[PDB]
Amino acid sequence: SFQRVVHVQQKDDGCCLWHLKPPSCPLLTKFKELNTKVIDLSKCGIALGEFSTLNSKLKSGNSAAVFMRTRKEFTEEVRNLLLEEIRWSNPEFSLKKYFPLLLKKQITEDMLWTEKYQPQTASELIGNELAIKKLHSWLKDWKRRAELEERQNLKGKEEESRLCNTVLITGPTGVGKTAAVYACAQELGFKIFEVNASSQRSGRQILSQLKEATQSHQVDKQGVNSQKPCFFNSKNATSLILFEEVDVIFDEDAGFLNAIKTFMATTKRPVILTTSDPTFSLMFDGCFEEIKFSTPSLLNVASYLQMICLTENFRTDVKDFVTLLTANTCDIRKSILYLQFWIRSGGGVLEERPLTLLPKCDSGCAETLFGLKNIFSPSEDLFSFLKHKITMKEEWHKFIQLLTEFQMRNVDFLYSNLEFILPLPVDTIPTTAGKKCSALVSHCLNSLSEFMDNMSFLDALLTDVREQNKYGRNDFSWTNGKVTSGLCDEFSLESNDGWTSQSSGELKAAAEALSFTKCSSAISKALETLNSCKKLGRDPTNDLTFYVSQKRNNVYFSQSAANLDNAWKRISVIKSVFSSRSLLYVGNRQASIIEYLPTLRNICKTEKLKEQGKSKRRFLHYFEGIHLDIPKETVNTLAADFP
Amino acid sequence: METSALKQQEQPAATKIRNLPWVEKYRPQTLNDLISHQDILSTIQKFINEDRLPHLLLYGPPGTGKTSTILACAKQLYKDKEFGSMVLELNASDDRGIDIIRGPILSFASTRTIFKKGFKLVILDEADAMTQDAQNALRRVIEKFTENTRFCLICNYLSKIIPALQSRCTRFRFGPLTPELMVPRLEHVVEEEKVDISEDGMKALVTLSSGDMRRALNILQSTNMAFGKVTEETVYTCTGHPLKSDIANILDWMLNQDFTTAYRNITELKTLKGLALHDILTEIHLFVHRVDFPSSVRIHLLTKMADIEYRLSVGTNEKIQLSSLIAAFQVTRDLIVAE
Amino acid sequence: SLWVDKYRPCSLGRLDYHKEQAAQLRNLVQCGDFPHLLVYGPSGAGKKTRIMCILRELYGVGVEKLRIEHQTITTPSKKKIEISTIASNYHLEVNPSDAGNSDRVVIQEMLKTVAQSQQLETNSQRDFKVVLLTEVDKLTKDAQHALRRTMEKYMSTCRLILCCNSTSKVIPPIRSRCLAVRVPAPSIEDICHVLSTVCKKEGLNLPSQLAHRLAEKSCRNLRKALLMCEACRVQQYPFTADQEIPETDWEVYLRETANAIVSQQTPQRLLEVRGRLYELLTHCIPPEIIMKGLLSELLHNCDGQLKGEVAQMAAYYEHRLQLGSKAIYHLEAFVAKFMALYKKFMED
Amino acid sequence: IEPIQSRCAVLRYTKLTDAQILTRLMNVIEKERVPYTDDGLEAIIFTAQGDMRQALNNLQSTFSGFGFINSENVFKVCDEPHPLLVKEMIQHCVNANIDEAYKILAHLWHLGYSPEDIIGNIFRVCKTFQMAEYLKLEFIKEIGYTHMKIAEGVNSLLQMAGLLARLCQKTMAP
Amino acid sequence: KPVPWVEKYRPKCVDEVAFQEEVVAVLKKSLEGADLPNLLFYGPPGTGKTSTILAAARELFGPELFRLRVLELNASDERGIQVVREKVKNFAQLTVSGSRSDGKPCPPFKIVILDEADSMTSAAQAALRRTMEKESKTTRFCLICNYVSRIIEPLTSRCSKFRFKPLSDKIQQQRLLDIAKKENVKISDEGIAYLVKVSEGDLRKAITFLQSATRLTGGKEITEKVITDIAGVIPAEKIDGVFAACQSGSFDKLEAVVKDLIDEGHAATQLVNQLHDVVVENNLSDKQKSIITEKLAEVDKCLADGADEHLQLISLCATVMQQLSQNC
Ligand SMILES: Nc1ncnc2c1ncn2[C@@H]1O[C@H](COP(=O)(O)OP(=O)(O)OP(O)(O)=S)[C@@H](O)[C@H]1O
Ligand SMILES: Nc1ncnc2c1ncn2[C@@H]1O[C@H](COP(=O)(O)OP(=O)(O)OP(O)(O)=S)[C@@H](O)[C@H]1O
Ligand SMILES: Nc1ncnc2c1ncn2[C@@H]1O[C@H](COP(=O)(O)OP(=O)(O)OP(O)(O)=S)[C@@H](O)[C@H]1O
Ligand SMILES: Nc1ncnc2c1ncn2[C@@H]1O[C@H](COP(=O)(O)OP(=O)(O)O)[C@@H](O)[C@H]1O
Ligand SMILES: [Mg+2]
Ligand SMILES: [Mg+2]
Ligand SMILES: [Mg+2]
Structure with a gap:
């Protein structure tokens, strides 16, 4: 057809703007002629080493250093010296009660170290002591009940006890929930029937295949009973059901929750649930005894990992496993597996360190953990590279690759260790000459302010690799943050961009490295004149030193410049006080925190002040007198002070 | 599913008595009939004739002739009696997830041909719209079945293809047509179609097209059938582009008068022509490098208009941004004029 | 049940201030076809009290019998996210901004659940279920576009009551349909009368001058005034003329940080202020609040010439903070730039 | 997901240093009798940023296409914006010549190069450019700002020329 | 049960929209041939583009087939254009047989009225171009915008373009008087004139604000206070107080003024709009106007970004105060 698509405009006559003419002023009539002549690229050839780090000379013999390490077995005296060294490193560790156990465990291998050093007894576990004693007491009571039932059967031919038939265990990944369950079961001779997420566990399958495990006896009661049937469908020992990763429900697992609720109702045998999802304690409807595994103490697990290193006849230091644990968030499974991979590869660096508190130390685990040994020469050290002046192209490329390897994880490396990396003294927390000293302090402060301005620029006006606050909001918030990973097999089908990830990573790494180089160079040339002020008699080093916490000096480097245990106890405090019945309906969130929480802390502190004055007892009863049901531990936490 | 029959008889579908599809009137047939990118086409034909055809990655702006080129290569490589048994073409219209790679692609690349022995060809139009996991499977299908079959991926944006899929192929960019060799096509079609046109019409046609023939012929036939004549005014009216005289008067108002009178005149002309601030900024930017300004003035103007074009995207009030655009010139060049 | 909740008005005739506003709202709901209500005003002006009042005047008395439910839904990137929700059989209230930049699901699919629930439920009272999205100002642009198309599509099944502190981040097609309810902060005498009531x-008899001091210290925030009155009741049984108004504890922490920055000018003090600011940020206090508090605290010490420069610096770095991700960089860089400006100002 | 990383040992692979890709490229060339010059070596190493697969594929493509390994053939097959043109961009902007820099960038834009690979090539050349450290830092910062502007969706000639003006003005302003 | 006012008194058919002469004439010529081409309407909001296209759809079809044969869609969907293209494909694939008892059978093509077409990226615009070319003879597209320059060359070249000049103040005042007398609302001319002034020449916002006021204050007169507080417009006394505070040169009263504005619940974007509208039409120097307008643009970018209102207004007022007191 091809009808006329007429541009119709209501062009009325007049208005002095519809029919315009080019201006008569000389500026807009002096159009410069366009030139298209660029330089010719055929004449100019690209020389070697221009756009890359190509050099004519090549290093030979410095690299490809094969280890061929044949570690001599330690004798008794050197082993005892290492034992006393670790005991002086950790005076609060019962290091004598564990070393025969691991020595018996060690006495051409086809085991992972997780199962080679598997704890047979719950007392061999490290950390979470209250939780494992609670579990052990619960299972001992279940054994006593089973033995009493057998006694009643042999003779024949429950609010006060409050024996709930199920424990639900929750904690972080790899803290040893399954290790605790298995260790308790082997110590008291139970028989675990495990249901994993790797198996098809639908409701009709699990009830028709595992109900009579609870309802009836075991036909085999003597002999091989410490064996673990993993349920799947394509002295006497008592049954014990265990559900590993209960929070993982697929569409194939149809009606799993109703099935384990029927198991809840109609059991006569212990039922154990293991999950790492904190929200599953709220969603599940049933009666169960709750056990929480906290994150274990860093020094205790570090001593245990040093210990696993000792029983494989290597010596080492505490601090490297401290930062190794920090990088893995105190995950014992990840640390043990990487420790196995690292020890069985023959070690990284042979450096001797004579400490009394002898073979050579094996420091340098966290450097190879982050892949920093693939960037640097084995002679190079990280902080040695970072403190000195970067001038060559290859050192620049090493700096960029280090920062890039730290930028994909959204970790600010130079920022977190800014005190230990600047050429300035760092100490742990416990007149014309004055004009020049103040000028030096001013120059150092100007350099610091400039660097931190570029760092703010980098966070604000530069793209990050991983999109921050993607599922929760920014850090230190009590809305949520328990974003469990996906649970459906359907694909993401997202339209994210890929180029702006490694492009932005290179960009942020290069900008951070250049800004830090500028700042460190400025600080260096500022303190090059500090000798003149020292000769003048005035020492501004008290105003130039950096005060940093004790916990950040226990590591070689940190991935964070704050305290996360502090933030964890805070977030627990707001979540616990604002889960009470009356204050659970304050919807305006920001208003709720900045108005209710400081006034509540003021009320708590005033209440403690009146209680310290030997006043009447009823002054304790304002919190109970307004029906404000807050637990006493959080009231005591609120009544201390504001940090 | 399907969706190929509608296009397949959509291409030979016309009234043939009244409609005039000038874009579809002149179409290339073979490699010797696409008079553009002679190096690319000769390279592809040399790859075909030596039986050394590698995985091709045809990328560039749309309308440059990638799909018709690879259709000509497929028709010359395999005859009509075995075209369907040896060539597998897919687009992004049949998008069901990432199962398209594991479906027809994996089954077709993992078997021999049926009737006549030879290497097969896979053509994937709009491969940048494919998801990252589907492309991560397509690279493995490419890697393990490279000997039996070759892959030709047609895309518009090169950045949306993963580095591995790029690194398994050789890249060919269909660049825009230099205006010179483009103009002979326009004079051929006007001499055939008996159209009144001036040289300003040719300048506008080669300016708005920016190196394509499809939208060029579209603009040409639309302006011709709407007005009967093709000039600068009629083309920029039919296209509804910023007229050069209007941008010149805008720059005159920002360069001569005071703030308020320039503001009122610009706002009146903007509501008179329906002209946005983004197109004003683009055309004023093209205008800045032609008008003889000092280096500092040019730098300051370019920085301010880049900032305003960024601010306009996040969705602020365009009125304030327009007044700030006036302010960007009132700060420097009217002060220099007063000096 | 504090005085901010035990004595919260639930009827439109109980509101002692904004009586014309309350009468207008009552007359609006007497028509029975009220639109989406975009209610704005500063925090503590009483927006939540007003929307509960219009809910009670709208529905029956059953909107007081509320329940708490957690909803878990699937991301388009195939991840499960859980979020709390205060709901009833008559209305549902969901905060959508707890999902970061993924607020678009909590906008769209949650509204789908309310629509299907209203299609399932029938009570012969009203033909809509009120969906209350508190803190809609913090929603992203993509989420607000999803919100716009959902109000265009779901208008005959549910009615939307948005509550915000500002209509700046709110996109204009949203405000083009929602009825605007500007609730200004009530005046000093209104706070004095509410405190007296x-x-x-x-059972207590406070003087007028203590109520006036409390109203002036609260900065026209009624909830803060009520909480400070409750704390003063904790401190002393009689409302004396020398009753010390309970100062906000993180506010005086911020004031001590202000004395820390203004007192000594050295990078060691900069690190100490950095540590204090980290400690203050770990208390989940939003960064714009410390930004405004720091501005108000240091603007006392500067002269009249430095105030404009410090103000523009604060606004620029606040915008950098809002664009950015880690607030600590932008905040502490403002500390550093103010430190440099102060040091180069008192040296000459 | 975090449970697998807990259940594994995480080994990190880095981008290959240009010496390594040069050595294995020379191994392939000496095993395949490829005629070459050092300019072609630098061009191939540039077109493959630490990517051995891309280097080998580009080398095979130019040897199958033109048969000789120099810079001109490699950039005729890889078809990137030419790094000498981008080096002349950066060199003009060091001298604060907005006219020549915008001349060369208008030439690049009219050749059909997208904004994304143009700013990518500008960053890649500017990373190894010979200038002062502070000017390199400010150049990198402005390049990253403009690159995020291209990433967010605004990608026109005006943004490119604006970045050119900012890079020029960083030299003429203290 | 009832409908909002804006969709109630829109014209039922063509030729009933006033102030437009050639647009309705070409529309009537296209309707007499029973063939609407691909249509593009551009003009400022509250002018009648949506009313004209809806009236044309009602005229060409039957009212019982009016809703079934048109599809209203917006281009600002958050999931890209994949959902929009699949919706258009679903609408064009589905065909509903229709019959009119008036004597004219319905034309076979379906109508997709797409709003906010100028908020569309070039890739999405080319995708829409290929979608329209796929359904050229089965679905005629409607594109609604204010700025035709944002629409790229191919869709703009293939569409019949129509300009909608906004209505004068007298015409919209007369129409609002007709609305007031039709809906039994007691109205003075001053209130309608102030409604026209605060709607900024948009009839849709004026009608919406009138309906909002007559439902907020039912059975009562419509004063200026309710219109001011419903339209969101800052009072002029507040703006003059801001100007006097910046002219004073004292920062303390400046802080007091912005604290009064913030605590009154006044939006910062509206304050910035009124401040700019007063600044650009005053006797200030061009340098002062330039610097004030640049700061206004930066602050409005910060507000649309989502920064703090109080700090942004403090900074803008500090810049205005320094610029005004620099000459003193
Ligand atoms: N506290 C611990 N003491 C000693 N070894 C431990 C400890 N926690 C974990 N392990 C080791 O880590 C291995 C695996 O621990 P698991 O119990 O499987 O982790 P988990 O608690 O189940 O967390 P999941 O299953 O990954 S969510 C055990 O076999 C031990 O070798
Ligand atoms: N070099 C050319 N010279 C003349 N006409 C051309 C040329 N390239 C393409 N065309 C026209 O474009 C039609 C088909 O080109 P396409 O292959 O669709 O373009 P394209 O490069 O593949 O970009 P697409 O298809 O829009 S993604 C041909 O039938 C011609 O009418
Ligand atoms: N000239 C006119 N004749 C008749 N009614 C008009 C006229 N101008 C505006 N209106 C009415 O004003 C109201 C709003 O106009 P609409 O057409 O719905 O929206 P608009 O003018 O397209 O602006 P948008 O949709 O926001 S871009 C409708 O009720 C129209 O009937
Ligand atoms: N008319 C009134 N009389 C007494 N107290 C009121 C009145 N209106 C509001 N309040 C109190 O003021 C506080 C304001 O808090 P809220 O309702 O959350 O408003 P916002 O959402 O603006 O912070 C409420 O806790 C309420 O108890
Ligand atoms: Mg486990
Ligand atoms: Mg094509
Ligand atoms: Mg409309």
Whole structure:
């Protein structure tokens, strides 16, 4: 057809703007002629080493250093010296009660170290002591009940006890929930029937295949009973059901929750649930005894990992496993597996360190953990590279690759260790000459302010690799943050961009490295004149030193410049006080925190002040007198002070 | 599913008595009939004739002739009696997830041909719209079945293809047509179609097209059938582009008068022509490098208009941004004029 | 049940201030076809009290019998996210901004659940279920576009009551349909009268000048005034003329940080202020609040010439903070730039 | 997901240093009798940023296409914006010549190069450019700002020329 | 049960929209041939583009087939254009047989009225171009915008373009008087004139604000206070107080003024709009106007970004105060 698509405009006559003419002023009539002549690229050839780090000379013999390490077995005296060294490193560790156990465990291998050093007894576990004693007491009571039932059967031919038939265990990944369950079961001779997420566990399958495990006896009661049937469908020992990763429900697992609720109702045998999802304690409807595994103490697990290193006849230091644990968030499974991979590869660096508190130390685990040994020469050290002046192209490329390897994880490396990396003294927390000293302090402060301005620029006006606050909001918030990973097999089908990830990573790494180089160079040339002020008699080093916490000096480097245990106890405090019945309906969130929480802390502190004055007892009863049901531990936490 | 029959008889579908599809009137047939990118086409034909055809990655702006080129290569490589048994073409219209790679692609690349022995060809139009996991499977299908079959991926944006899929192929960019060799096509079609046109019409046609023939012929036939004549005014009216005289008067108002009178005149002309601030900024930017300004003035103007074009995207009030655009010139060049 | 909740008005005739506003709202709901209500005003002006009042005047008395439910839904990137929700059989209230930049699901699919629930439920009272999205100002642009198309599509099944502190981040097609309810912060005498009524209903007799001091210290925030009155009741049984108004504890922490920055000018003090600011940020206090508090605290010490420069610096770095991700960089860089400006100002 | 990383040992692979890709490229060339010059070596190493697969594929493509390994053939097959043109961009902007820099960038834009690979090539050349450290830092910062502007969706000639003006003005302003 | 006012008194058919002469004439010529081409309407909001296209759809079809044969869609969907293209494909694939008892059978093509077409990226615009070319003879597209320059060359070249000049103040005042007398609302001319002034020449916002006021204050007169507080417009006394505070040169009263504005619940974007509208039409120097307008643009970018209102207004007022007191 091809009808006329007429541009119709209501062009009325007049208005002095519809029919315009080019201006008569000389500026807009002096159009410069366009030139298209660029330089010719055929004449100019690209020389070697221009756009890359190509050099004519090549290093030979410095690299490809094969280890061929044949570690001599330690004798008794050197082993005892290492034992006393670790005991002086950790005076609060019962290091004598564990070393025969691991020595018996060690006495051409086809085991992972997780199962080679598997704890047979719950007392061999490290950390979470209250939780494992609670579990052990619960299972001992279940054994006593089973033995009493057998006694009643042999003779024949429950609010006060409050024996709930199920424990639900929750904690972080790899803290040893399954290790605790298995260790308790082997110590008291139970028989675990495990249901994993790797198996098809639908409701009709699990009830028709595992109900009579609870309802009836075991036909085999003597002999091989410490064996673990993993349920799947394509002295006497008592049954014990265990559900590993209960929070993982697929569409194939149809009606799993109703099935384990029927198991809840109609059991006569212990039922154990293991999950790492904190929200599953709220969603599940049933009666169960709750056990929480906290994150274990860093020094205790570090001593245990040093210990696993000792029983494989290597010596080492505490601090490297401290930062190794920090990088893995105190995950014992990840640390043990990487420790196995690292020890069985023959070690990284042979450096001797004579400490009394002898073979050579094996420091340098966290450097190879982050892949920093693939960037640097084995002679190079990280902080040695970072403190000195970067001038060559290859050192620049090493700096960029280090920062890039730290930028994909959204970790600010130079920022977190800014005190230990600047050429300035760092100490742990416990007149014309004055004009020049103040000028030096001013120059150092100007350099610091400039660097931190570029760092703010980098966070604000530069793209990050991983999109921050993607599922929760920014850090230190009590809305949520328990974003469990996906649970459906359907694909993401997202339209994210890929180029702006490694492009932005290179960009942020290069900008951070250049800004830090500028700042460190400025600080260096500022303190090059500090000798003149020292000769003048005035020492501004008290105003130039950096005060940093004790916990950040226990590591070689940190991935964070704050305290996360502090933030964890805070977030627990707001979540616990604002889960009470009356204050659970304050919807305006920001208003709720900045108005209710400081006034509540003021009320708590005033209440403690009146209680310290030997006043009447009823002054304790304002919190109970307004029906404000807050637990006493959080009231005591609120009544201390504001940090 | 399907969706190929509608296009397949959509291409030979016309009234043939009244409609005039000038874009579809002149179409290339073979490699010797696409008079553009002679190096690319000769390279592809040399790859075909030596039986050394590698995985091709045809990328560039749309309308440059990638799909018709690879259709000509497929028709010359395999005859009509075995075209369907040896060539597998897919687009992004049949998008069901990432199962398209594991479906027809994996089954077709993992078997021999049926009737006549030879290497097969896979053509994937709009491969940048494919998801990252589907492309991560397509690279493995490419890697393990490279000997039996070759892959030709047609895309518009090169950045949306993963580095591995790029690194398994050789890249060919269909660049825009230099205006010179483009103009002979326009004079051929006007001499055939008996159209009144001036040289300003040719300048506008080669300016708005920016190196394509499809939208060029579209603009040409639309302006011709709407007005009967093709000039600068009629083309920029039919296209509804910023007229050069209007941008010149805008720059005159920002360069001569005071703030308020320039503001009122610009706002009146903007509501008179329906002209946005983004197109004003683009055309004023093209205008800045032609008008003889000092280096500092040019730098300051370019920085301010880049900032305003960024601010306009996040969705602020365009009125304030327009007044700030006036302010960007009132700060420097009217002060220099007063000096 | 504090005085901010035990004595919260639930009827439109109980509101002592904004009586014309309350009468207008009552007359609006007497028509029975009220639109989406975009209610704005500063925090503590009483927006939540007003929307509960119009809910009670709209529905029956059953909107007081509320329940708490957690909803878990699937991301388009195939991840499960859980979020709390205060809901009833008559209305549902969901905060959508707890999902970061993924607020678009909590906008769209949650509204789908309310629509299907209203299609399932029938009570012969009203033909809509009120969906209350508190803190809609913090929603992203993509989420607000999803919100716009959902109000265009779901208008005959549910009615939307948005509550915000500002209509700046709100996109203009949203405000083009929602009825605007500007609730200004009530005046000093309104706070004094509310405090007098609350204290009389509690069996106490406070003086007028203590109520005026409390109203002036609260900065026209009624909830803060009520909480400070409750704390003063904790401190002393009689409302004395020398009753010390309970100062906000993180506010005086911020004031001590202000004395820390203004007192000594050295990078060691900069690190100490950095540590204090980290400690203050770990208390989940939003960064714009410390930004405004720091501005108000240091603007006392500067002269009249430095105030404009410090103000523009604060606004620029606040915008950098809002664009950015880690607030600590932008905040502490403002500390550093103010430190440099102060040091180069008192040296000459 | 975090449970697998807990259940594994995480080994990190880095981008290959240009010496390594040069050595294995020379191994392939000496095993395949490829005629070459050092300019072609630098061009191939540039077109493959630490990517051995891309280097080998580009080398095979130019040897199958033109048969000789120099810079001109490699950039005729890889078809990137030419790094000498981008080096002349950066060199003009060091001298604060907005006219020549915008001349060369208008030439690049009219050749059909997208904004994304143009700013990518500008960053890649500017990373190894010979200038002062502070000017390199400010150049990198402005390049990253403009690159995020291209990433967010605004990608026109005006943004490119604006970045050119900012890079020029960083030299003429203290 | 009832409908909002804006969709109630829109014209039922063509030729009933006033102030437009050639647009309705070409529309009537296209309707007499029973063939609407691909249509593009551009003009400022509250002018009648949506009313004209809806009236044309009602005229060409039957009212019982009016809703079934048109599809209203917006281009600002958050999931890209994949959902929009699949919706258009679903609408064009589905065909509903229709019959009119008036004597004219319905034309076969379906109508997709797409709003906010100028908020569309070039890739999405080319995708829409290929979608329209796929359904050229089965679905005629409607594109609604204010700025035709944002629409790229191919869709703009293939569409019949129509300009909608906004209505004068007298015409919209007369129409609002007709609305007031039709809906039994007691109205003075001053209130309608102030409604026209605060709607900024948009009839849709004026009608919406009138309906909002007559439902907020039912059975009562419509004063200026309710219109001011419903339209969101800052009072002029507040703006003059801001100007006097910046002219004073004292920062303390400046802080007091912005604290009064913030605590009154006044939006910062509206304050910035009124401040700019007063600044650009005053006797200030061009340098002062330039610097003030640049700061206004930066602050409005910060507000649309989502920064703090109080700090942004403090900074803008500090810049205005320094610029005004620099000459003193
Ligand atoms: N506290 C611990 N003491 C000693 N070894 C431990 C400890 N926690 C974990 N392990 C080791 O880590 C291995 C695996 O621990 P698991 O119990 O499987 O982790 P988990 O608690 O189940 O967390 P999941 O299953 O990954 S969510 C055990 O076999 C031990 O070798
Ligand atoms: N070099 C050319 N010279 C003349 N006409 C051309 C040329 N390239 C393409 N065309 C026209 O474009 C039609 C088909 O080109 P396409 O292959 O669709 O373009 P394209 O490069 O593949 O970009 P797409 O298809 O829009 S993604 C041909 O039938 C011609 O009418
Ligand atoms: N000239 C006119 N004749 C008749 N009614 C008009 C006229 N101008 C505006 N209106 C009415 O004003 C109201 C709003 O106009 P609409 O057409 O719905 O929206 P608009 O003018 O397209 O602006 P948008 O949709 O926001 S871009 C409708 O009720 C129209 O009937
Ligand atoms: N008319 C009134 N009389 C007494 N107290 C009121 C009145 N209106 C509001 N309040 C109190 O003021 C506080 C304001 O808090 P809220 O309702 O959350 O408003 P916002 O959402 O603006 O912070 C409420 O806790 C309420 O108890
Ligand atoms: Mg486990
Ligand atoms: Mg094509
Ligand atoms: Mg409309």
